[PDB]
Design a protein around this ligand. Structure first.
Ligand code: ZN
Lengths: 85, 286, 55, 278, 471
């Protein structure tokens, strides 16, 4: 029973493969860390203005008095709510 | 007269492009072009430069040609568009100087009374910093010869300027930033040990030149005196530092105390989260 | 029926040793890209600053 | 009819002179003429960016002084090569680098002078190693309003140019405009020696110099221990009921690696005496 | 082995017979009595999928075809297998002399078809003169190429099970993307081998958005539909000769010769002289493209010399894209050749010009010239690795992707993974993760479990190649 047992002690090396699957999990770790840190130019995006909504008007249009400034009829986006004006 | 230089790589690339301009034509010897400069202190700066055509036959190294009209024209150009700059010298691409270079130097020391050259190499592999500085003053001689007009090796460096590396480090792309903690120290070990003690062994090869030859200026003025500045440590056998083993132990002292304490705290760092998250993953995996 | 078994699983084992050696240097090179990301984070504040206050 | 995917090669002395010129005249915009070599349809190269004189009143097409054109270009002809201009450059240090009115005023002049006549748009206050601030364009004529706009025969490497949809005001200015591909190509004559300059002049300069050390002891012990007590606070608050607690933050940061680099480099500094001295 | 004989067991005996890795007792297992040739024949399957070197795997093969010539039935699966692995030009001639003795009609048919669709393009077309310098007429019938692709054309015209509603739901696209050529990419791919022309006839302006690929794709999708279609090419494209169309610039006349090359793909008649003359009598290099591609495609093993002569001196430095066509043509006529003339005249040529198209195309060409080598190029491959950024390392990746086709060699994977992640140029990373599908198609169940980790890279380059690799 030469290789009748050699192959069995190499079936034991499937438990060597769990360490490899662990290492594959280690490489999958920090992959989303690097894909998060490369996507920090989202934070490098230009600023924005806080304003004052009087009340909306027709044709999906609204009004904003910004911080020191007068009135500016501004345009609406898609992911927002006219019903929350 | 010149303390040191602050030389940007842009003027070196401004040498490189004219090297490209001459590699395509009949190249007799090398490049001789203008070196502009921004001289403020006894320190030196260069922002830019340009070239000038040049040929040289080798029969009495006196047949060599520039165009001072063209030189002063484009100097007037770059002086008008930038009043900061002025000429400060020249440059050449062949790494070994020759005897015509003093005629070049003193023939262009008439516009400004100093004209520092720049040795470079278009194919550098073994040197350190390409930038080199000489100056032409006289010590006249110990034997006081009739005008021993000598180039005098002024210290040099690569300069530095804010946001001039915007192109550079984006281009080269291969830089492993902050390798502190890995193998930079041993690269410096290999190169400083081998590539400085080969400078030392070629100094002793020059000493063998003084043995078999070297009557010329055999130079018993500066050589053994700066070598006595070396010979502050005559490090012969029996090693003579019984009065420095305790100082070396004092050197070992604080760092090994830091090592002991801190790396015990580093094991203390790793083990906590490692054990907790380890058995978390282990018996909450199913 | 035996000789087919280690002709599969030995090849599996040496393929797995191949990638088990590779993934180590993979996870190594990720930390260099992470240090480049660190310098990209650090260089957001060098020359300027414009003081406000948190509202 | 049909047009092959264009490319703008650079020489990077171009980009260095752009940043240096916009640094020299930095509170003001400048104007310039770009020199290079018209190679073919699908590529074009800038090999040389030369200085162009100032105006003070208005940057205009009349910043191109023709006596300066004659003088400058002929003294480049008796410099290394009489190569051909490939366009023009300018700056806009005041804002986010989009096309001024003067640019479209001189665009017809430049496309009367050049074939492509590609612009160069730059802001000199951006970064120190990273940004690729340069921006280049091609105004397509309003006379081809009948035919479709920007055919670009393959539009696959043009789609591989299309990657960020950059500069939302220029994409507002997508009326007869589009940016172009600019690669930073290799110079085998120059790249390895720039790398030589860079690396072998920054690795200890002469590579023999520092191979500070005795007060960073105290500096590092402060910077470590003062953060370490708040690094060890949180096991007070660690508990069970897995999601019923919410504050996971790592604490081992900058006390593995800062201490690693610190203590290993300073024990090699304790090795300097045996390395240099015998 | 005496214990195997006493135990009577055959597969333990063959396990021990390969333990020695030698023909001594491996000869004795097939020297036994009652050895069933079925078990002894999937023993060939076993040893085919396992033995690593070609030093003695083919020797095991040929000693088994020896012992099958010792089998009393005149065997032809044995020569059917070793003729396409151990690639014997004289053994097919000698079994043809056995056909001359035998005088059957089953004898010259099935092994002929096996080599006739499952051997090298160069191999049978080279050896056919050895085999023919009655069954002597039957080999002319079913070795030439006069019936198989024609009945395949018949199979595909009369095997039409398609849809047109999808073509309508994309026919109503209006916009100026080049997806209007993807509409005919669809109706040409899903209608190959029909030669019914129901797609050129539903348009006036849907065809007339004249660019390069509008012209070229419009006259190329017809040839994709005309896959096969040996005889009727000239008198069906009488209107579509290169001088009978008046193109936009050059591609309603370029794609005509491209479609003729598709029609005569791998089965050429006058598609050497005819095509090479009409490209030799062609105005510039901006026309010669598809004719050159189909010329190299049909000219596999025809020893065409003008494809080596006039292409390099046609470009003289470079071309637009027909330098890529030149690399492809010389690679296809010199597939797996180690063209030592063109090792020199391609890779001591792809360094001194500057563009991206000409260099990338010669890169694909010097990839294509070397194929299935398994040892024979790899010093040159690392010599390509030590070159500049975008060209030779990329082509070394493609060339090791072609030199290791069909094997699980663990040599390519070293530099493959190394340049796949360690490099900073990203298109070469995309190529390096593309390469695994090129080298791992025989045992394809290895890839996805490890390319799933490649799927989460920083870049869309390696993620894109990881999406291509599973495919
Ligand atoms: Zn402007």
């Amino acid at each position: 029973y030469l290789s009748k047992i050699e192959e069995l002690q190499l079936i034991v090396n499937d438990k060597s493969q769990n360490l490899r699957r662990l290492q594959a999990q280690r490489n999958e770790l920090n992959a989303k860390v690097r894909l998060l840190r490369e996507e920090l130019q989202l934070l490098q995006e230009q600023g924005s203005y806080v304003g004052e909504v009087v009340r909306a008007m027709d044709k999906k249009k609204v009004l904003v008095k910004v911080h020191p400034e007068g009135k500016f009829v501004v345009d609406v986006d898609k992911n927002i709510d006219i019903n929350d004006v | 007269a010149v303390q040191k230089v602050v030389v940007h790589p842009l003027v070196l690339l401004s040498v490189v492009d004219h090297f490209n301009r001459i590699g395509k034509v009949g190249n007799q010897k090398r490049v001789v072009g203008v070196l502009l400069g921004s001289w403020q202190k006894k320190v030196l700066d260069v922002s830019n430069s340009f070239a000038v055509p040049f040929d040289e036959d080798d029969k009495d190294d006196s047949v060599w040609f520039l165009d001072h009209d063209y030189l002063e024209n484009m100097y007037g150009m770059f002086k008008k568009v930038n009043a900061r700059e002025r000429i400060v010298g020249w440059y050449h691409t062949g790494p070994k100087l020759h005897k015509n270079d003093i005629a070049i130097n003193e023939l262009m020391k008439r516009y400004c009374p100093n004209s520092v050259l720049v040795i470079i190499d278009v194919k550098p592999k073994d040197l350190g910093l390409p930038t080199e500085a000489y100056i032409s003053v006289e010590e006249v001689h110990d034997d006081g010869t009739p005008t021993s007009k000598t180039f005098e090796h002024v210290t040099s460096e690569i300069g530095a300027e804010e946001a001039e590396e915007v192109g550079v480090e984006h281009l080269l792309r291969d830089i492993k930033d902050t390798t502190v903690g890995t193998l930079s120290q041993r690269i410096t070990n290999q190169v400083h040990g081998l590539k400085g003690l080969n400078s030392k062994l070629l100094d002793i090869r020059s000493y063998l030149e003084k043995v078999a030859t070297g009557k010329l200026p055999i130079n018993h003025q500066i050589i053994y005196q700066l070598q006595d500045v070396f010979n502050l440590l005559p490090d012969v056998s029996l090693q003579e530092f019984v009065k420095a083993f305790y100082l070396k132990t004092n050197d070992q002292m604080v760092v090994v105390y830091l090592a002991s304490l801190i790396r015990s705290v580093v094991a203390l760092h790793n083990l906590i989260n490692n054990k907790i998250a380890n058995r978390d993953a282990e018996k909450k995996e199913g | 029926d035996l000789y087919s078994r280690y002709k599969k699983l030995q090849q599996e084992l040496e393929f797995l040793e191949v990638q088990e050696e590779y993934i180590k240097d993979e996870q190594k090179n990720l930390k260099k890209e992470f240090l480049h990301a660190q310098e990209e984070v650090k260089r957001i504040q060098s020359i300027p600053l414009v003081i406000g206050q948190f509202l | 009819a049909v047009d092959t995917a264009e490319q703008v090669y650079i020489s990077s002395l171009a980009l260095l002179k752009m940043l240096k010129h916009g640094r020299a005249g930095v509170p003001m915009e400048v104007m310039g003429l770009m020199l290079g070599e018209f190679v073919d349809d699908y590529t074009v190269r800038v090999i040389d960016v030369f200085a162009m004189p100032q105006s003070g009143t208005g940057v205009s097409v009349e910043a191109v002084d023709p006596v300066f054109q004659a003088k400058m270009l002929d003294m480049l002809k008796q410099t290394g090569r009489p190569e051909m201009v490939v366009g023009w450059y300018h700056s806009h240090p005041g804002f986010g680098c989009w096309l001024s009115g003067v640019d479209i005023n001189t665009q017809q002049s430049f496309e009367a002078l050049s074939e492509r006549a590609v612009a160069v748009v730059v802001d000199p206050i951006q970064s120190v190693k990273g940004k690729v601030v340069i921006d280049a364009f091609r105004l397509i004529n309003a006379n081809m309003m009948v035919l479709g706009h920007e055919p670009r025969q393959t539009t696959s490497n043009l789609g591989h140019l299309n990657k960020p949809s950059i500069q939302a005001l220029i994409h507002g200015l997508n009326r007869h405009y589009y940016s172009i591909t600019i690669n930073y190509r290799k110079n085998e004559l120059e790249q390895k020696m720039l790398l030589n300059l860079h690396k072998k002049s920054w690795m200890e300069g002469l590579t023999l110099q520092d191979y500070v050390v005795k007060e960073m002891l105290e500096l590092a012990k402060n910077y470590n221990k003062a953060v370490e007590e708040e690094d060890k606070m949180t096991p007070e608050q660690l508990a069970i009921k897995n999601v019923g607690k919410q504050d996971p933050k790592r604490h081992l940061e900058e006390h593995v690696d800062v201490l690693m680099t610190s203590n290993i480099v300073q024990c090699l500094a304790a090795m300097l005496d045996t390395v240099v001295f015998k | 082995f005496q214990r195997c004989l006493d135990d009577h067991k055959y597969k333990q005996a063959i396990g021990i017979a390969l333990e020695t890795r030698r023909l001594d007792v491996f000869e004795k297992t097939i020297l036994e009595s009652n050895d069933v040739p079925g078990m002894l024949a999937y023993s060939l399957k076993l040893c085919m999928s396992l033995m690593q070197n070609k030093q003695f795997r083919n020797k095991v093969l040929r000693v088994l075809v020896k012992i099958y010539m010792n089998l009393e039935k005149p065997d032809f699966i044995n020569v059917c297998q070793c003729l396409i692995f151990l690639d014997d030009p004289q053994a097919v001639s000698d079994i043809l002399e056995k056909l001359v003795k035998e005088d059957n009609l089953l004898m010259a048919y099935q092994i002929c078809f096996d080599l006739y669709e499952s051997a090298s393009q160069q191999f049978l077309s080279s050896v056919i003169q050895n085999l023919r310098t009655d069954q002597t007429l039957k080999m002319i019938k079913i070795l030439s190429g006069e019936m198989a692709i024609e009945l395949h054309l018949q199979f595909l015209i009369r095997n039409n099970n398609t849809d047109l509603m999808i073509l309508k739901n994309t026919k109503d696209a209006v916009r100026n993307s080049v997806c209007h050529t993807a509409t005919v990419i669809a109706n040409s791919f899903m209608h190959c081998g029909t030669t019914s022309d129901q797609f050129l006839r539903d348009n006036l302006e849907w065809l007339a958005r004249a660019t390069n690929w509008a012209k070229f794709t419009a006259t190329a999708s017809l040839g994709v539909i005309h896959k096969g279609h040996e005889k009727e090419a000239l008198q069906l494209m009488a209107t579509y000769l290169p001088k009978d169309t008046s193109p936009g610039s050059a591609y309603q006349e370029g794609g005509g010769l491209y479609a003729l090359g598709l029609i005569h793909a791998n089965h050429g008649g006058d598609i050497i002289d005819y095509l090479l003359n009409q490209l030799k009598n062609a105005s510039n290099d901006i026309v010669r493209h598809g004719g050159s591609l189909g010329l190299g495609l049909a000219a596999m093993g025809t020893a065409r010399q003008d494809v080596y002569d006039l292409l390099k001196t046609n470009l003289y430095q470079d071309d637009a894209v027909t330098g890529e066509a030149a690399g492809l043509a010389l690679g296809l006529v010199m597939l797996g050749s180690k063209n030592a003339q063109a090792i020199e005249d391609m890779v001591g040529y792809a360094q001194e010009t500057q563009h991206e198209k000409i260099l990338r195309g010669l890169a694909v060409g010097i990839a294509l010239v070397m194929y299935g080598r398994m040892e024979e190029a790899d010093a040159l491959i690392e010599s390509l690795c030590r070159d500049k950024d975008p060209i030779l390392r990329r082509s070394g990746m493609y060339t090791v992707a072609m030199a290791y086709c069909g094997s699980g060699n663990n040599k390519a994977i070293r530099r493959l993974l190394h340049v796949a992640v360690s490099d900073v140029n990203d298109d070469v990373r995309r190529a390096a993760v593309e390469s695994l599908g090129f080298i791992l198609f025989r045992t394809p169940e290895q890839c996805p479990s490890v390319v799933s980790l490649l799927s989460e890279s920083y870049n869309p380059h390696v993620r894109y190649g990881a999406a291509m690799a599973l495919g």
